[PDB]
Amino acid sequence: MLSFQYPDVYRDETAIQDYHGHKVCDPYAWLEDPDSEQTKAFVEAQNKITVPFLEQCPIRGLYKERMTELYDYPKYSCHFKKGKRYFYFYNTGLQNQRVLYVQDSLEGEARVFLDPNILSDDGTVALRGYAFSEDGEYFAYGLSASGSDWVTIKFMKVDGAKELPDVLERVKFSCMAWTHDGKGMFYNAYPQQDGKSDGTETSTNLHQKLYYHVLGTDQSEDILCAEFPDEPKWMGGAELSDDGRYVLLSIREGCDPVNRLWYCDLQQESNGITGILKWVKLIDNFEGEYDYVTNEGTVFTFKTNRHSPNYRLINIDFTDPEESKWKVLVPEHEKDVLEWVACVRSNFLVLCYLHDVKNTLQLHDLATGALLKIFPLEVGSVVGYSGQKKDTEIFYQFTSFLSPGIIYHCDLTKEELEPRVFREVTVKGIDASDYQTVQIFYPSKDGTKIPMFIVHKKGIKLDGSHPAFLYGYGGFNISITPNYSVSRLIFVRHMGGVLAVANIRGGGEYGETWHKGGILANKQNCFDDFQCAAEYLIKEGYTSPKRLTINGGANGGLLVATCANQRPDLFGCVIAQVGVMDMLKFHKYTIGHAWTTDYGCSDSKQHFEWLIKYSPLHNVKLPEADDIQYPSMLLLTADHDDRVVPLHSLKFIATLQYIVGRSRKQNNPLLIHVDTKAGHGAGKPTAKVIEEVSDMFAFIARCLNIDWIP
Ligand SMILES: O=C(NCC(=O)N1CCC[C@H]1C(=O)O)OCc1ccccc1
Numbered sequence: 001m002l003s004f005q006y007p008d009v010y011r012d013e014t015a016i017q018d019y020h021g022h023k024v025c026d027p028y029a030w031l032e033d034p035d036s037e038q039t040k041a042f043v044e045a046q047n048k049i050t051v052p053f054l055e056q057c058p059i060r061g062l063y064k065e066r067m068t069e070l071y072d073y074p075k076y077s078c079h080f081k082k083g084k085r086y087f088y089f090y091n092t093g094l095q096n097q098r099v100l101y102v103q104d105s106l107e108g109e110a111r112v113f114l115d116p117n118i119l120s121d122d123g124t125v126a127l128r129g130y131a132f133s134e135d136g137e138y139f140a141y142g143l144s145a146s147g148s149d150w151v152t153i154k155f156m157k158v159d160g161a162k163e164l165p166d167v168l169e170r171v172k173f174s175c176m177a178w179t180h181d182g183k184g185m186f187y188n189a190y191p192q193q194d195g196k197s198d199g200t201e202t203s204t205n206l207h208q209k210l211y212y213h214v215l216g217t218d219q220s221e222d223i224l225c226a227e228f229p230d231e232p233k234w235m236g237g238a239e240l241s242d243d244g245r246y247v248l249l250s251i252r253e254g255c256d257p258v259n260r261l262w263y264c265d266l267q268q269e270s271n272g273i274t275g276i277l278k279w280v281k282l283i284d285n286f287e288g289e290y291d292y293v294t295n296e297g298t299v300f301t302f303k304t305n306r307h308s309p310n311y312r313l314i315n316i317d318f319t320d321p322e323e324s325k326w327k328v329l330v331p332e333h334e335k336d337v338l339e340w341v342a343c344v345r346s347n348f349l350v351l352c353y354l355h356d357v358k359n360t361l362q363l364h365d366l367a368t369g370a371l372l373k374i375f376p377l378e379v380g381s382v383v384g385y386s387g388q389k390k391d392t393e394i395f396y397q398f399t400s401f402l403s404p405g406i407i408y409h410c411d412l413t414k415e416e417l418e419p420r421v422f423r424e425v426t427v428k429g430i431d432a433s434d435y436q437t438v439q440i441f442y443p444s445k446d447g448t449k450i451p452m453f454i455v456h457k458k459g460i461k462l463d464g465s466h467p468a469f470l471y472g473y474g475g476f477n478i479s480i481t482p483n484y485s486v487s488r489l490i491f492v493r494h495m496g497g498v499l500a501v502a503n504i505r506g507g508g509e510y511g512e513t514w515h516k517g518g519i520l521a522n523k524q525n526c527f528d529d530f531q532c533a534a535e536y537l538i539k540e541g542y543t544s545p546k547r548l549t550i551n552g553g554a555n556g557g558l559l560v561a562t563c564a565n566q567r568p569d570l571f572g573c574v575i576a577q578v579g580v581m582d583m584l585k586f587h588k589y590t591i592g593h594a595w596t597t598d599y600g601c602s603d604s605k606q607h608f609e610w611l612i613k614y615s616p617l618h619n620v621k622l623p624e625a626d627d628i629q630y631p632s633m634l635l636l637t638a639d640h641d642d643r644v645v646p647l648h649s650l651k652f653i654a655t656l657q658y659i660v661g662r663s664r665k666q667n668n669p670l671l672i673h674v675d676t677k678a679g680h681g682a683g684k685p686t687a688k689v690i691e692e693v694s695d696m697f698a699f700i701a702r703c704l705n706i707d708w709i710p
Contacts, residue, residue, distance in 0.1 A: 001667070002667060006049070006657045007048075009042060010030070011027035012026075020608055024618070032202065032651075034639070034646065042654070043639075050673045057702050058708075060698035062494075063490065064694040067487060070490065071094070077089035077090070077098070078386055078395035078397045081136075081386070086106060094686055096116075097117050097683075101113055114139075114141065124678070126684075131176035132178070135182060140153055141156070142174070144679075144683055145199075147641065147679025147683055148198060149199070149590075149591070151172060155167075166219075170197070171187060172189075173208065174187050174188035175239060177239045179247075180244025184214040186210060186211070188235070188237065189209055190208055200642075202642075202645045205591050207228075207229065207232050209224060210225045211224060228251075234251050234252070236249050237250045241295050246266065248261065258305075260283055261282050288307075290304050293343055294389055310333050310337050310512075312331055313328075313338070313341060313351075330369040335510070338351060339359070344394055344412060345391065346366075349364045350385070352385075354508075357439070358380065358381075358482070359398075361374075361375040361377060375410070377398055380398055380403065381400070381482050383398070384396060385397070395407060400482045401499075403484060404427050405424075405425070405484060407421075434457060437453055439451060439453050440536075444529045444532045450529050450533065452500060466497060467498070467543065468497060468499075470549070471499075471551050471552060472502045472552050472559050473555055475507065475526065476507075478507055487693040504559075505525045506525070506555075530563055545569060545570055546704070549573040549704070550571050551576075551577070553576075553578055553579070554643070557581070558581065560574050560575070560579075565616060568630045573634075574631050574632070574633045574634070575696050575700070576634070578636065579644065579649060580644050582617045583617070584608070585602070590645060620655045620660060629667065630666060634673070636672075638677075639675070639678070643680035644680060650672070650674075675692075
């Protein structure tokens, strides 16, 4: 099968660094420079062998054709109202980017409001964030090129969709919030830096500032409202209270669900916004999260995890702020996580809970916190919602593994608040009734029961003969909930596969305790949990090692790469997307410094000791047994992935090819594909999404010798 030869890659054997007495060699350190001729030549040489390998078999084209056909279905976001108009996103089916539409009434004819497709031939310019003025007459929107996190904010007058001259640069990881007087907008920006700022650089991002832009002026005139020069990693995001009276500043440092909370009563400013605001430091520490829901005068309602790992709602009165005085509006549930809360129709609260990895949605009274109405949902996830304080209706979007989704609407001015289907689309070609989703809980190494969803064709025999695709993430308090994936369903229908998603520790499925169970000293729990998920699928007869593929992206790329090093005997194929592979140097680049809250940092001897044991780049080793080789591996990254710099995957593949690829027993391929004009994943155009999944499933099919089932 392997008719190709791995490229020559120079090893800098002098690249040695001492980590607390532990000498670490990094022979491919030079791949950290994306601009050198050496690095460019490396990428070219790697793609040169990967592309023909992926395109040789007819299966890639078959998969691509089927994906193009089945993914071609109307895709709508739920409606949301701003001012006197309604807005919604819509993709006719295969447009590179979804389009923002506007209508003057629910019955009115909709018209194109913002079409990102006309900004590029290939759809590599995408919307990244936006904010309407409080009256809905003005609109600010961020644009990112080639998938970079960097944003350029532009503006439009809503009536007539008129482009305005205002342009804001150096924006990244920014908030967008208009003051209610309609004069301007708060946003974040980073100081100037040498070199590039286009997504191909690896420069660390520090000293993020909070600025206020007055509409109709040059960015150079912007007001500096908050800065933290003594704390380079702090990031202060601004939002206006519902009544427009207070600017709330949520300061974050790192990735834990915690934040300082400062406020500024705008009425108390000496003469409007003219400089550093008179911040009142309500919560001046990083011990808990305080997510603004709404306020009534000085009584502020926040969703918090302060001594409540499953989250709860509290009221903090700015006039009697001490913690002993806070009121618990909606107490913490013993097991269900309160995911998010919104205030609508003045005195209603919409609460979304996660019950065993499935969403529930309900309406509560703002004054007492009492449950008023349960909005029934099938097994799945709530992925969209609209309804602000002044609105008198809500829209919410539901999705699941077998259902593309349903958008519901509920008029809250009605006595009996009962929802109605607003929009529903079914994908012709995939009959939901032929498949089933089951949820099981398997014990991990330490006995902890971990949830896992398994999706497969009804009536299959559990004889271990089926190809399986097992996905996991495991970290950053992210919950991996049900979602509709045409690409995965094609694997089920056309490749006879079984899909599985393991809700391993590190995620947010069981609140902050679940998160803490998969970080820092306990990061190994994630890998153990995931390996145990694979062992469950095998023991129960869904699949066998040789037919099992594992996949994950970014922190999930780290997950599958570590699992390949630790248990190469358990997997037949591994697809690691945009993975964090160098755990000793991740903190040095772009926004990597923020991930130390989940991983630790190698500067600390204690942390280094945890990190060195699982870092993918530092644990590539030939399996001892002659009958064991590494699984087939495919790394996917892109040259503008400034979230997880591509050097991670470049150094990792060089190491795999040298240490393992050179061995005579290694017959499974170890490849990388580096895309252009793309980044971490957000905003990737439809055309690229299709090529990507086609590469993935063609790799699986060729390596495992799977025939296409028409
Ligand atoms: O870095 C992330 N998110 C985490 C992220 O993208 N990660 C964390 C690990 C690698 C990668 C991933 O898994 O996609 O977002 C940037 C940010 C914004 C505000 C405050 C701090 C940080």
